[PDB]
Amino acid sequence: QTTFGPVFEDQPLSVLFPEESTEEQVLLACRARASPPATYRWKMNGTEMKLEPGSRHQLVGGNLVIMNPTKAQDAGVYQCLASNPVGTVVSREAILRFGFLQEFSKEERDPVKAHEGWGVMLPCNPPAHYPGLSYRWLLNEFPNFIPTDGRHFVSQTTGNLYIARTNASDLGNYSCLATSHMDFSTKSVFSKFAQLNLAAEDTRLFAPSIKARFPAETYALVGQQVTLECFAFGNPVPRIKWRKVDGSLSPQWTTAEPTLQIPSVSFEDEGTYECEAENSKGRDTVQGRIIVQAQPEWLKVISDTEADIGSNLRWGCAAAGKPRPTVRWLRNGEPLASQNRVEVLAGDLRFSKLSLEDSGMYQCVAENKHGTIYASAELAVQALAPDFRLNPVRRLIPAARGGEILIPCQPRAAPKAVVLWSKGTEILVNSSRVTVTPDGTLIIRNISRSDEGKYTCFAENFMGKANSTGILSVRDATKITLAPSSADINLGDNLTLQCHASHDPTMDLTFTWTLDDFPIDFDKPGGHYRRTNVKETIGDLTILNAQLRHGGKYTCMAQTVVDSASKEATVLVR
Amino acid sequence: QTTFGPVFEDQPLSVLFPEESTEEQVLLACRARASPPATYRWKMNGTEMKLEPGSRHQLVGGNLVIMNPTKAQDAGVYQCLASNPVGTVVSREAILRFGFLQEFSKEERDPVKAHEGWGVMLPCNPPAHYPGLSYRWLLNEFPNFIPTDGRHFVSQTTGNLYIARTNASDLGNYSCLATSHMDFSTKSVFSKFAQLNLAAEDTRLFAPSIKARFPAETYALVGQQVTLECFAFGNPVPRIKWRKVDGSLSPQWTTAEPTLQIPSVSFEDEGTYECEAENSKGRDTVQGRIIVQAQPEWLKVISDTEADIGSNLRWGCAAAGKPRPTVRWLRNGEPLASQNRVEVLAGDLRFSKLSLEDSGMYQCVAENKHGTIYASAELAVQALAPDFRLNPVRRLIPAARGGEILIPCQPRAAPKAVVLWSKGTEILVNSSRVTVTPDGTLIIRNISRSDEGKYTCFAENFMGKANSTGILSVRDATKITLAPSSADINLGDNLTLQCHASHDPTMDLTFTWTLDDFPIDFDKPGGHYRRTNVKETIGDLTILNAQLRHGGKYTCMAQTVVDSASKEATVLVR
Numbered sequence A, B: 001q002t003t004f005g006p007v008f009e010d011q012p013l014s015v016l017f018p019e020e021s022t023e024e025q026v027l028l029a030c031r032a033r034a035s036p037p038a039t040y041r042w043k044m045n046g047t048e049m050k051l052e053p054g055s056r057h058q059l060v061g062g063n064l065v066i067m068n069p070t071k072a073q074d075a076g077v078y079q080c081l082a083s084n085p086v087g088t089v090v091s092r093e094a095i096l097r098f099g100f101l102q103e104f105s106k107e108e109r110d111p112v113k114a115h116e117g118w119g120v121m122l123p124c125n126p127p128a129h130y131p132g133l134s135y136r137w138l139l140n141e142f143p144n145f146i147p148t149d150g151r152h153f154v155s156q157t158t159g160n161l162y163i164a165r166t167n168a169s170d171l172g173n174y175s176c177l178a179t180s181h182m183d184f185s186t187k188s189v190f191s192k193f194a195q196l197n198l199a200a201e202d203t204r205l206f207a208p209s210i211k212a213r214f215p216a217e218t219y220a221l222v223g224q225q226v227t228l229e230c231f232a233f234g235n236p237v238p239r240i241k242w243r244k245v246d247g248s249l250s251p252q253w254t255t256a257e258p259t260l261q262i263p264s265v266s267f268e269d270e271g272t273y274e275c276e277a278e279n280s281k282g283r284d285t286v287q288g289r290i291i292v293q294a295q296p297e298w299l300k301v302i303s304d305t306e307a308d309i310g311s312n313l314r315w316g317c318a319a320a321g322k323p324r325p326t327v328r329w330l331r332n333g334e335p336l337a338s339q340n341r342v343e344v345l346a347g348d349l350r351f352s353k354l355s356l357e358d359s360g361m362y363q364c365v366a367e368n369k370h371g372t373i374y375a376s377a378e379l380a381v382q383a384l385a386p387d388f389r390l391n392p393v394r395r396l397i398p399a400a401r402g403g404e405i406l407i408p409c410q411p412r413a414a415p416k417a418v419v420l421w422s423k424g425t426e427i428l429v430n431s432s433r434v435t436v437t438p439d440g441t442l443i444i445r446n447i448s449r450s451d452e453g454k455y456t457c458f459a460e461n462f463m464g465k466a467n468s469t470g471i472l473s474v475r476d477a478t479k480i481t482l483a484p485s486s487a488d489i490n491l492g493d494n495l496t497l498q499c500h501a502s503h504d505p506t507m508d509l510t511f512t513w514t515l516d517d518f519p520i521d522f523d524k525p526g527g528h529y530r531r532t533n534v535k536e537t538i539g540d541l542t543i544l545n546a547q548l549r550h551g552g553k554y555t556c557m558a559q560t561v562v563d564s565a566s567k568e569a570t571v572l573v574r
């Protein structure tokens, strides 16, 4: 019933298109549920695209289809806007990134001079790539495989060889290679040879000197695997120990391998770590830190709301992320700034004197360095004509003579309706005796046998007019013309109390007695209370075989179907 | 929208059709508002009429028209029934009565012998009539007029002459006449002559003897004029005094005329009256009573009601009349008796386990000897499929670690819906840790990092099925790792209190201090409270220039957007 903001059900997702692939198209999906159905626009780097006919970019039911994707003119960030007569909404981002691995530079590698017994550096300066590759080293023949012993180390972050000790077998020509691991294809690129030569021998057992070290500060989101690498020059082969300064490591990680690995990281891993190289000739240690961060997550969002013209509203948001997020507001896909009767403050939204214009689709955005999140809601403002169906004025208003009466008149209206009372055809301007409160309730005091008749309440606003009618009748009031008396007796004695009343001739009158505000039962078998002198106006009560519990404050009450009256006395029982 | 019982707006009215008139038709009106429009039937003495084509009785839009009305076959009591697919209603009665005045009997009146100086009786036995007539007497000539002095009296309830004293001028022949006073026509009927003759006489004065007296018991509704007549035989002309035994008469009625009149009667006139004839030779007095009564009137009626299948209902009625009325119930124009799940008792109606069949038009009838009154209402029973629009399950359910959570699931259904919970795709059979109450609320104790996910509630009844979904997430809980200490100081001293807390790394934590559960202000200019050691986990407070009012129980509370914790201490100031 045209009460459908363009709610989202499928927002686009980031893609990594491999280069030199065998595909021809990519799809970015956008799906909205709306009534009437919504229309879609696509933003690329912010500027609204001009989706011409089927030249490259095309629209298929809200999904974006690019043709012949290439990094030259298709890599970017894409957004989808779903618009309706009610309002518009904006979806989350979708990044399209390409993947490739170029060819190694063709110039010859310089020959590194070495002296037998020391350590040497063999870098292999990997070419441009995306994403990170896996590195290996080759010697002499293709394909051989350099052994992965404790004498050599090949880091996976720079790839340089770490030849701890140099001897005769190290003569040859070293080449690097890189392997790209992707979902679709795998590529391997080899490097030109670098012939290493060794000078005269010089061997002495020396203290380790740490060369490959993990950086002091290492940021890592919660859920990622972290690998800290460590290596030192030492003869004989040193041993590497990993420890935590402000804690202890899990037994699954208490290993002496030169690369400490954490498969999953939570907030308990944040702290300081120490890598120590140890041998019979020395020891060298290096410290560093690990910091854990997280993306924002919602804690409290907004929801759909229908209000009425003239009222006020309050809306809120709340997020949670390790670098604290910031919250901002959107109206129909546009930034919302504090103006007029809309007040925004750091994630709370206030509407004062809500109007008809304030209806639409609102959005809440929480952002930090690691990501952004969205939430949507709809505000609808309603105007209503006066209606008395739910709360009509009482049809029958029996009022005792010489008393006060109050008749409220509150129709269901939006905004509030002006209320005017009348009796018959005359219009009531209030006086000392008749009063008309601003709320519309009409109160009459000092009632008599001349106020009976038909009363009408008229409610009007700029939307409509309604009206209701009641009938007022007057009767005589109840009276108590005799009150009982206090007494003191012994347990097991009999006492009598009297109570007389007068009432209107046309109604029924009943007598009820309470003991300390507790109604006294007379139909109880073996009961100690008996009605006596039972007439239309006489309702005496006799206590037979009095007990301790019968002491207290007795209260006689004469009640009709309309009103009541009461009198009090007390009895003590020993 | 087919929610219209045949409400009444014009019910028939009693008529008095004068005989020997010049009219040819009568109309009895019946009007009902209904949607769809209602159909009408007419009852005459109770049997449903067979309204044939236009032979005498005819129907015009719900109104009844009889043709050539005559007392022979048209005088009765008429009722109108308005029927709809929703239900039927029955209107109040309407009595049709004729009015006429026949011709006086043609036989000669007997000659009444009289003895001069006495009193004589001259009745005139009025013929059949409706309604009561006005009586007058004629003597000798037509038209003469006998004087209305104190010597003669002509009562209006029997019409007989009361000649107090008889003398020579009383010789003649007396005739009666009756005049019928109606709205349309006036008719006068004269009677044959009765020749009165007089014998010898005497000469003396005697005591009065009352002859025409008012009856001892006289019933009179509220609003009617009551006339009590009195006369006695007395020479000379006696005087009549009217008094009240248990009260005093109004000055407008304290008159000595031989007919006491009350234009309007209220309940204060009920009692005993005395008429006294007085003269120089004697006095005779006669007593009687006046009893005042009233017709039933409503005090509390029923109204339209929509309920749901499976519930219970209570309805009531109340009337007021001097002869106490009796209340009975009608369903669709038929008497309602206590059967099955409907219980009737002396004006209260109880529905137990309301079904779909109990929908329709109900009516309440209050009756006594002086009249009857009706009231109408409609009962509608609704069945509803489950719906979660008004009360959906919470979308975000942040739960602290190691605590308890409760999630209710109450859809809008009629009757109640069976509720089954599930996590993901598994079905939860409830145990020590997880409990599913009969109301549907699911409670989990001892929450860990294994309970997060998506929870679903399925509600089903014989009308339909619906479901709702929520998301559960777990976070660390707040703590207070340091509590303050009690102290005693003098007015004007400075005191420091400490309070430390721990919380989840991704949320904000704030400290608030209260004095005897009243929040302590820190931004108050010239305030005595200053925040100190303000860190993320340290929120100390210092009292500067302490006053008497600063003594009491301090409470430090560390709170987040989700949960909170608190600790207490006390300070005394002299």
Ligand SMILES: *[C@@H]1O[C@H](CO)[C@@H](O[C@@H]2O[C@H](CO)[C@@H](O[C@@H]3O[C@H](CO)[C@@H](O)[C@H](O[C@H]4O[C@H](CO)[C@@H](O)[C@H](O)[C@@H]4O)[C@@H]3O)[C@H](O)[C@H]2NC(C)=O)[C@H](O)[C@H]1NC(C)=O
Binding pocket: A466, A467, A468
């Ligand atoms: C106090 O009462 C009413 C509102 O509660 C207010 O308006 C009048 O009465 C009804 C409101 O229900 C208006 O509509 C009428 O409804 C009745 C039955 O529900 C019908 O009989 C009426 O028939 C009219 O049909 C034509 C088109 O509507 C009219 O042109 C024609 O004249 C008939 O009246 C009608 O549907 C109704 O129109 C108004 N006005 C009148 C004059 O009745 C009412 O005026 C309030 N009283 C006062 C003194 O202000």
Ligand SMILES: *[C@@H]1O[C@H](CO)[C@@H](O[C@@H]2O[C@H](CO)[C@@H](O[C@@H]3O[C@H](CO)[C@@H](O)[C@H](O[C@H]4O[C@H](CO)[C@@H](O)[C@H](O)[C@@H]4O)[C@@H]3O)[C@H](O)[C@H]2NC(C)=O)[C@H](O)[C@H]1NC(C)=O
Binding pocket: B466, B467, B468
């Ligand atoms: C828990 O969720 C729902 C109840 O809330 C329950 O019913 C299923 O989902 C929707 C409920 O809104 C049913 O109606 C669907 O609505 C969505 C969008 O609102 C549409 O995409 C669906 O399209 C259907 O259209 C045809 C005619 O309706 C179908 O024949 C066709 O197969 C499409 O599904 C449809 O209008 C929906 O029918 C049901 N059922 C299913 C299978 O979705 C849902 O089953 C509950 N889940 C569980 C596990 O019990």
Ligand SMILES: *[C@@H]1O[C@H](CO)[C@@H](O[C@@H]2O[C@H](CO)[C@@H](O)[C@H](O)[C@H]2NC(C)=O)[C@H](O)[C@H]1NC(C)=O
Binding pocket: A430, A431, A435, A436, A437, A438
């Ligand atoms: C009715 O009479 C009162 C005086 O008793 C007028 O004054 C109002 O009284 C209400 C009672 O609570 C208060 O709100 C104010 O003292 C008055 N209200 C306003 C709006 O002035 C009142 O104005 C009279 N109503 C009319 C004339 O419609």
Ligand SMILES: *[C@@H]1O[C@H](CO)[C@@H](O[C@@H]2O[C@H](CO)[C@@H](O)[C@H](O)[C@H]2NC(C)=O)[C@H](O)[C@H]1NC(C)=O
Binding pocket: B430, B431, B435, B436, B437, B438
């Ligand atoms: C859930 O476990 C409880 C036991 O703790 C089962 O017993 C019900 O517990 C409620 C709790 O107030 C009580 O009404 C009764 O003791 C039991 N109710 C009924 C209808 O038997 C309960 O049945 C379990 N829920 C299930 C099985 O759905």
Ligand SMILES: *[C@@H]1O[C@H](CO)[C@@H](O)[C@H](O)[C@H]1NC(C)=O
Binding pocket: A044, A045, A072, A073, A074, A075, A076, A077
């Ligand atoms: C779009 O954005 C990307 C990344 O910010 C940028 O590389 C590119 O040059 C932009 N413009 C295009 C694709 O036309």
Ligand SMILES: *[C@@H]1O[C@H](CO)[C@@H](O)[C@H](O)[C@H]1NC(C)=O
Binding pocket: A402, A446, A447, A448
């Ligand atoms: C109520 O009205 C009557 C007049 O009808 C008057 O005599 C009486 O004093 C009024 N009540 C009060 C409390 O003034």
Ligand SMILES: *[C@@H]1O[C@H](CO)[C@@H](O)[C@H](O)[C@H]1NC(C)=O
Binding pocket: B044, B045, B072, B073, B074, B075, B076, B077
């Ligand atoms: C109808 O009722 C009246 C009054 O009770 C009665 O006089 C008459 O005979 C009845 N039958 C008719 C009018 O056919």
Ligand SMILES: *[C@@H]1O[C@H](CO)[C@@H](O)[C@H](O)[C@H]1NC(C)=O
Binding pocket: B402, B446, B447, B448
């Ligand atoms: C709460 O659960 C944990 C494990 O999740 C358990 O070790 C602990 O004892 C439980 N609490 C209580 C009070 O048993």
